[PDB]
Ligand binder design. Structure first.
Ligand code: ES5
Ligand code: ES5
Ligand code: CL
Ligand code: CL
Length: 163
């Protein structure tokens, strides 16, 4: 575990993380996809061997000795708000199990279902709160990666509010 487990946020490409493992915002089919998933495919393509997994689950594939945790958030275009919310919480619980099993001291994580799976809605608070529910009982240092400068500010404030 980390000596003093923390949450941090960085505004940069998760493919350039400084953590001991990465969470992919995967699609269920293990396809290269777009956004975070495409960046992860370009950096760790070997990790996409038999990575296909259902919505609400996480599957880890090693790139050399570097673990890539493929986490499949719901596409809110297809799911009801109620069912999507359940699957989004579940995906994060499976990430917490995998991070614990791997025995890593740190993990890089994107906010699941906030991009092309958002169904055109702002889900920063929804997705972050499910991330905290899952990861609060783990002792890994968590580093959240985002792109938008105003999202960085909002994520940073939400972390600081609990400290
Ligand atoms: N500041 C950022 C955040 C995310 C990115 N993703 C890919 C490429 C450049 C990026 C820059
Ligand atoms: N957390 C994020 C958000 C968007 C990105 N786009 C490309 C590559 C990495 C990225 C990480
Ligand atoms: Cl997404
Ligand atoms: Cl963002």
């Amino acid at each position: 575990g980390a000596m003093a487990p923390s949450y941090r946020v960085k505004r940069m490409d998760i493919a350039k993380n400084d953590e001991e493992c990465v969470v992919n915002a995967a699609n269920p089919r293990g396809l290269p996809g777009d956004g975070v998933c495409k960046a992860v495919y370009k950096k760790w393509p070997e990790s996409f061997k038999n990575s296909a997994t259902p919505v609400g689950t996480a599957k880890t594939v090693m790139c050399g000795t570097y673990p890539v945790i493929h986490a499949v958030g719901p596409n809110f275009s297809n799911y009801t708000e109620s069912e999507g919310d359940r699957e989004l919480a579940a995906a994060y619980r499976e990430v917490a199990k995998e991070v614990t099993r791997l025995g890593v001291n740190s993990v890089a994580i994107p906010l699941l279902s906030t991009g092309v799976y958002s169904g055109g809605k702002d889900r920063l608070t929804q997705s972050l709160n499910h991330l905290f529910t899952a990861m609060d009982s783990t002792d890994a240092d968590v580093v959240i990666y985002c792109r938008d400068k105003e999202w960085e500010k909002k994520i940073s404030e939400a972390i600081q509010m609990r400290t």
